[PDB]
Design goal:
The complex is a heterodimer of chains A (about 425) and B (about 40).
Chain A (H helix, E strand, L loop, with lengths): L7 E4 L6 H15 L3 E4 L4 H8 L8 E5 L3 H6 L10 H4 L4 H6 L1 E2 L2 E2 L2 E6 L2 E5 L13 H9 L4 E3 L6 H9 L4 E6 L2 E8 L3 H15 L9 H9 L3 E6 L4 H6 L4 E4 L3 E2 L2 E2 L3 E9 L6 H12 L2 H10 L4 E2 L2 H6 L4 H12 L1 E2 L6 H16 L5 H10 L10 H9 L5 H13 L1 H17 L2
Chain B lengths: L1 H15 L3 H9 L2 H8 L3
The chains are: A alpha/beta (about 425), B mainly alpha (about 40).
The complex binds a molecule of 2 linked components (GLC-GLC) and zinc ion (2 copies).
Chain lengths: ~425, ~40
């Protein structure tokens, strides 16, 4: 039903250090008397557009910026209007990642890029290229260990190899991402996914290795390398593995190009606490103290706040993160990114498991890179707009909805005319 | 079948709420005018 008025519900992904974020919520609570609740649901990036479509869910949603355009296209986020004095606190390229159709739709938090993590004790010199990993594995498998384990179930982790020699999502032409030009099944992406599949066929990796298996194997010293982001550093720190964070290996002499994500905090368009959330994000979280509380839980990476990024400039692991980010590409925020990730996830899974050939999986993924009817129905927008704070712009949304849907216009007339005779 | 479950929620939303936002929508739709036609003929 109604989002609670007078408090803040926050949704953030389970690997992002929600406990540190909750600590800044408790400081917000002691300073204001407003309770802040941080939750971490499973399949968060899918649950939010489903519940917010009817005007439900959290006041603040945390995720990488690539999902937010589809959220904004479906009318699920409120426009972000920060002062010029606050826009100058964050780097402009972080603001660009959350700008959609000209309007800011989220607050940037931190910049995330995948890096090569390696055990310095097992591998004093990590490989510079993807090509030398098979020989490194047969050398390490002779002593029971293994070379590299990373999550193969999410295409986010295998995308750097796919894009390294020519793979891309949508081409950028004149400030507009070309929905028509998709580079999912070109020769560069074909050779990248083939190298990953070949290393499974040669038993250098298992097709079913996921996030938990890969992370535990590295933290237990079972594999010499892994591929992950900054949020994984603190779990490695408590494992006492002498690790290093360095540039990702090259493929065909080309640097692997990870998809750069900017962690961002959106505001629900149906939330009655839009002013409280702006106060929370600008004056409490986007501070040196606020980011330090989150970063100490799970590291953020290259934060958007200039002041704390200066304090965090001297980290070699953050320098390696920016290097891989500079070699990678910023993620598009267009609504079609939802269908892009779905298509590539199916191809990587159907090519790694042995189910389809690399060319058949990518060709099918090239076709499916288009969003299909994941837009709210005419019955949900009304419920969402009616469950949203009242304004002349919200009331006009209700009218244009009814004027285009007769049987909803009919239901509204019959239910309100009966109400109008209750008070005569 | 969730469309009916939302039609159940839209129904109970309109019958219990009486906020002035919906009042503006009632008047903009001419609902008070259509009811005043019923109370004569
Ligand atoms: O794999 C598809 C997935 O990639 C990205 O998700 C990342 C996220 O950005 C990171 O912060 C971290 O949580 O790892 C995730 C992958 O498991 C995109 O952000 C997401 O939209 C996309 O579905
Ligand atoms: Zn609801
Ligand atoms: Zn959880």
């Amino acid at each position: 039903m109604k989002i609670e008025e007078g408090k803040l519900v926050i949704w953030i992904n389970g690997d992002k250090g929600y406990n540190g974020l909750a600590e800044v919520g408790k400081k917000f609570e002691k300073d204001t008397g407003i309770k802040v609740t941080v939750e971490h649901p499973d399949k968060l990036e899918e649950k939010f557009p489903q519940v917010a479509a009817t005007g439900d869910g959290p006041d603040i949603i945390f995720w990488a910026h690539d999902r937010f355009g589809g959220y904004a296209q479906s009318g699920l986020l409120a426009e972000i209007t920060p002062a010029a004095a606050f826009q100058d606190k964050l780097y402009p390229f972080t603001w660009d990642a959350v700008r959609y159709n000209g309007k800011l739709i989220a607050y940037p938090i931190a910049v995330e890029a995948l890096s090569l993590i390696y055990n310095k004790d097992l591998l004093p010199n990590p490989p510079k290229t993807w090509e030398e990993i098979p020989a490194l594995d047969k050398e390490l498998k002779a002593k029971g260990k293994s070379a590299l384990m990373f999550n193969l179930q999410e295409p986010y982790f295998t995308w750097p190899l796919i894009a390294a020699d020519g793979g891309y999502a949508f081409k950028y032409e004149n400030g507009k991402y070309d929905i028509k030009d998709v580079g999912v099944d070109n020769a560069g992406a074909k050779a990248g996914l083939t190298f990953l599949v070949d290393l499974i066929k040669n038993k250098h990796m298992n097709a079913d290795t996921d996030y938990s298996i890969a992370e535990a194997a590295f933290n237990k010293g079972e594999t010499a390398m892994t591929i992950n982001g900054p949020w994984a550093w603190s779990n490695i720190d408590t494992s006492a593995v002498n690790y290093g964070v360095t540039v990702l290996p090259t493929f065909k002499g080309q640097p692997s190009k990870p998809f750069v994500g900017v962690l961002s905090a959106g505001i629900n368009a149906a939330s009655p606490n839009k002013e409280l959330a702006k106060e929370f994000l600008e004056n409490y979280l986007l501070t040196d103290e606020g980011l330090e509380a989150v970063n100490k839980d799970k590291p953020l990476g290259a934060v958007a706040l200039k002041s704390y990024e200066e304090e965090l400039a001297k980290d070699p692991r953050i320098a390696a993160t920016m290097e891989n980010a500079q070699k990678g590409e910023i993620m598009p925020n267009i609504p079609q990114m939802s269908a892009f990730w779905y298509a590539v996830r199916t191809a990587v899974i159907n090519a790694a498991s042995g189910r389809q050939t690399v060319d058949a999986a990518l060709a099918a993924a090239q076709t499916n890179a288009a969003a299909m009817s994941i837009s709210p129905s005419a019955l949900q927008d009304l419920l969402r707009t009616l469950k949203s704070p009242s304004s002349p712009q919200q009331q006009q949304q209700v009218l244009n909805i009814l004027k285009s849907n007769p049987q909803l216009m009919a239901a509204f007339i019959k239910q309100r005319t009966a109400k109008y005779v209750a008070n005569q | 079948s969730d469309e009916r479950a939302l039609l159940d929620q839209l129904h109970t939303l309109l019958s219990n709420t009486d906020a002035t936002g919906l009042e503006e929508i009632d008047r903009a739709l001419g609902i008070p005018e259509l009811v005043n036609q019923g109370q004569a003929l």
